[PDB]
Amino acid sequence: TTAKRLSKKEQKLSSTKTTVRRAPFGRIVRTIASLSSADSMRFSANAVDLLQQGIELYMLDLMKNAALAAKQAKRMTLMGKDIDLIQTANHEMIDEAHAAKLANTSSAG
Amino acid sequence: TTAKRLSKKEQKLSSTKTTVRRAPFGRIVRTIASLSSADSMRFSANAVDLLQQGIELYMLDLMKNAALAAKQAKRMTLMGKDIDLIQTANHEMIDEAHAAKLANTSSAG
Amino acid sequence: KNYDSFATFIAKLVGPNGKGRKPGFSAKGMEVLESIVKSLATEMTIVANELAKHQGRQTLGAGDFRTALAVRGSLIAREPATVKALTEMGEKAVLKYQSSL
Amino acid sequence: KNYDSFATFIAKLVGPNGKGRKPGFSAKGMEVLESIVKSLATEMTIVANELAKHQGRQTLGAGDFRTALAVRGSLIAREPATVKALTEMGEKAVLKYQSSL
Amino acid sequence: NVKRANERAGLKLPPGRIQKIIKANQTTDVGRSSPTASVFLTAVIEDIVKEIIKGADKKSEERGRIRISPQDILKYLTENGEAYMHILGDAFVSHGGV
Amino acid sequence: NVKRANERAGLKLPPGRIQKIIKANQTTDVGRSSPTASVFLTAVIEDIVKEIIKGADKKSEERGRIRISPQDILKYLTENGEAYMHILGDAFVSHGGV
Amino acid sequence: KHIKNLGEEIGNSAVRKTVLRTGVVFRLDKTVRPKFHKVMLSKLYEAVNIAKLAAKHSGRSTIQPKDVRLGLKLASIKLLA
Amino acid sequence: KHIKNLGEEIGNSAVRKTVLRTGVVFRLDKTVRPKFHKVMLSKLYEAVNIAKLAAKHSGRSTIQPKDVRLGLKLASIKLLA
DNA sequence: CTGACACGTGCCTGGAGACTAGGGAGTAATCCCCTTGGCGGTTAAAACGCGGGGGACAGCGCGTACGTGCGTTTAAGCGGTGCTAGAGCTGTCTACGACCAATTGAGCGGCCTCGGCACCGGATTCATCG
DNA sequence: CGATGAATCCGGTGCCGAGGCCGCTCAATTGGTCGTAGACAGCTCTAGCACCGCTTAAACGCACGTACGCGCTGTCCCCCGCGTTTTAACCGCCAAGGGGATTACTCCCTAGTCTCCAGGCACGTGTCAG
């Protein structure tokens, strides 16, 4: 039940904390902005904090829906083939080759 | 292998004839137009066809998604609880009460 | 040059309280409570303007907005009281304003 | 007296008898072939006006449409393969009429 | 001077500020915008805001403290009083938890 | 005269009719709308529609006939040439197969 | 004639036809029908009353293609394109 | 080698915290982690490059809060309300 | 705790009378297109009883594959410092959209014809359970 | 080793849509300014970027054992199949009148300019609330 105990405090931490730390967000954001061009986009100090509060909540909602779908199948755990079903049920078209190229090959730094 | 042939015929040959005939559709549309009002609203001759072409094509996508979910759940038939998952994952929750008065209390046309 | 916002006016709503006290607030919730107003205003104004173009008119007042509120109530399937009280209040306010002509 | 429809022009663009088959057209083909143009010219101009308003301008001199077409080709994960060709075609057309003055 | 807009319709928020927002989004086929639409819109918005604040304040005290926080807005009055919630659409309030 | 503005810019559709619908959504505060906006949009739309028509014509003759119908546009071509389909992702078109 | 109440005007065979138009699942249980009826009527009620209100706002009494087109557009269902 | 390869900076801990943040499912298999990263990065790219284009179109070379607030709205994801 | 918001103050420009032109919305008048409605005669489709079978739910066995505790890194993170790209406001000259005559042909609305597709009737692949 | 219901293909038919005319009546040019908007050179001061040293939370990898996903099998019940009966689309035809659509007109309530003063915006300040 350690998972249950940690999930008890996870919401209370969520009221003030973030899932991925600030510097690993500043990088990632800067690296992606630097693509599709050849210039340093020179972000501000509040755009990153505005982006985080949207993306993290969006994916919290997505995984909540996916876990709800997984429970319905009388399966306790969560599998990847549950996400694709939710994504295609929301008509959210995606590209797989581009996503694989983005995730696999980069340097960030 | 009778349902397979029935589906093969329905998919191709019947690309014009709708699932529900025109006269019952007109009767239900006229009955629902006078709900929550105090005047016989009349209609036109080309609006009902547009309403049909909208509603039926809207329901077909939802049923395709629900059937895909049911097949993904390692099942062969289809159950009503499959539709509820898609309805929740796509938002727009229905007031359970209204649909009942609509299907049950409403009785005319 | 000044900036125009509802930061003070949001703090100006009903706070005098004798039976419940608590006329409190904070600066963390100011941003969300002032974005709510802008969101509602834009959302209903868009629908009122779109509904106006049907009639061929080019004027908005006490009409198109009321029908926009009714449409945003019907689309939500809200409880009848939520939209009924709001529209009755709006009619009362417009009557109070137009009493003095 | 006069109307707004593209039937004559829609039934004209493709050069007939490519191999000996002039493009025929049904009654219901026209409805979809005009609705596509309507929808495209509506959404693209909406996203090209909401960006010129963001900049703080008054004129849409086709430089506020290039970055709307690019936005609409990036939002749909559509690779620039068939967006750069359209952009080049549009830029070539713009110069054609402009130079004639 | 009638610039005492608060006592004109008994409201609080200044109708003018809402009117500029109204005039911001209007396709170039309307213009006009009679001044009696702003009063209607401002009254509706004022009632909504007053009700949500009144509802959230009482519960934001039981948890402790005497202020109003984004979590103390998302909880209860948005989750309990969903009538003033479904009208806007999504919630996505803030760092307010679940 | 350069009444052949279609010939002036090498187009087929009349730019004025596209400008009529361009101006329908200007949300005020902008106005103006220089005439160079219509030519670019008209050229792009003309290329799109020409490609769609050419493909649908090429692929309709496999079933036979000399007509283009919603069944020959929704299915057959758009599910094959999805590049011009995704840009208007909400197909839901007409009496067609899939 | 004996039973005229709403819902069954959408025939029992209509559900089979619309679920068989897609070649994924060829069977359905007893509880699928009421969910279909409730969903379809819940959508249609809003999609028709929006058009009725938009028609009545501009005077007139008879609904017309423009009004139903606007209602469909506002009901988050996007027509031919 | 290390080269801070992209996507791993959203470590397994972030995915686990996101999954356990809700209280319905307390387990996750090995297929979830490689899917979460690719689900996130596409959305982040499609919501960042739009704001970059909007920032470049208005002169300038730096991104401000209004640009990203416009990009989030355009990316079909609503914000605080 | 320590710093943040509610209290207090000074100022200025934007919200207000106010008076006027000038056009758009309300409204009576008029006719003719089009919605609704009743009859009925074939005739297709939905509703219904019956039988056999395959598909959902449920136990058991199995084994590999997550969760957990523990020692070990390792970059998040603070506060400080310095350096400079670029947001932001101002002053000047001008190109190019706007509104107004005057002219003229191109596409909208009707008519006329002739084939395109819906339709049926006939000849047969694959197959198949004896 | 044949061979059911049919896997699709050939041979026409005539019944109304799509394509070729056919003048005409406004919609797209064409010239002619001109007064605001977009451009653009200069500048001044702000915040974004880059690096150092210390400390401690947090992600991280390994050993081990159990919870749980998956395949097997008996089942029994509920969905489909098929003939048959009941209903009710639906197409041809004739009324009947509601209400869409155009015109006249005239008076109200928005648009715009001229002038003023007090409400709202930007600093000190302390005392409690995270």
Numbering used by the authors:
A (entry chain A), B (entry chain E): 45 to 153
C (entry chain H), D (entry chain D): 67 to 167
E (entry chain G), F (entry chain C): 59 to 156
G (entry chain F), H (entry chain B): 12 to 92
Authors' own words:
Medusavirus medusae (MM), named for its ability to turn the Acanthamoeba castellanii (A. castellanii) host into stone through encystment, is one of the few NCLDV known to encode all four core histones (H2A, H2B, H3, and H4) on separate genes. We utilized cryogenic electron microscopy (cryo-EM) to reveal that the predicted viral core histones from MM form octamers that assemble with DNA into nucleosome-like particles (MM-NLPs). Just like its eukaryotic counterpart, MM-NLP207W contains two copies each of H2A, H2B, H3, and H4 as an octameric core formed by histone fold regions, wrapped by DNA in a left-handed superhelix.
Data for both samples was collected on a Titan Krios G3i to obtain electron density maps of crosslinked MM-NLP207W at 3.3 Å and native MM-NLP207W at 4.9 Å. We observed electron density for all core histone helices and ~135 bp of DNA, allowing assignment of the MM-NLP207W core. The overall geometry of the DNA superhelix and the layout of histone fold helices are near-identical between MM-NLPs and the eukaryotic nucleosome (RMSD for histone core, 1.9 Å), with minor differences in the wrapping of DNA ends. Most unusually, MM-H3 has a 29 amino acid long C-terminal extension that is not observed in any other H3 histone from any species. This region forms a 9 amino acid α helix that extends from the end of α3 and lays across its partnered H4 α2-helix and H3 α1-helix, then extends to reach the DNA minor groove at Super Helical Location (SHL) ± 1.5 (i.e., ~15 bp from the central base pair denoted with ɸ in Figs. 3 and 4). The electron density in this region is well-defined and consistent across both the crosslinked and native structures, indicating that the observed features are not due to crosslinking artifacts. This additional helix further stabilizes the H3–H4 heterodimer through a combination of hydrophobic packing and hydrogen bonding interactions. A second unique feature of MM histones is the extended H2B L1 loop connecting a shortened α1 and α2 helix of the H2B histone fold. This loop, which is 11 amino acids longer compared to eukaryotic histones, resembles a β hairpin and has a well-defined density that protrudes from the DNA superhelix by ~15 Å and extends beyond the equivalent region in eNuc by 7 Å. The base of this loop packs against H2A by forming a hydrophobic core centered around H2B F91, H2A I126, and H2A I111, and enforced by several potential main chain–side chain hydrogen bonds between H2A and H2B.
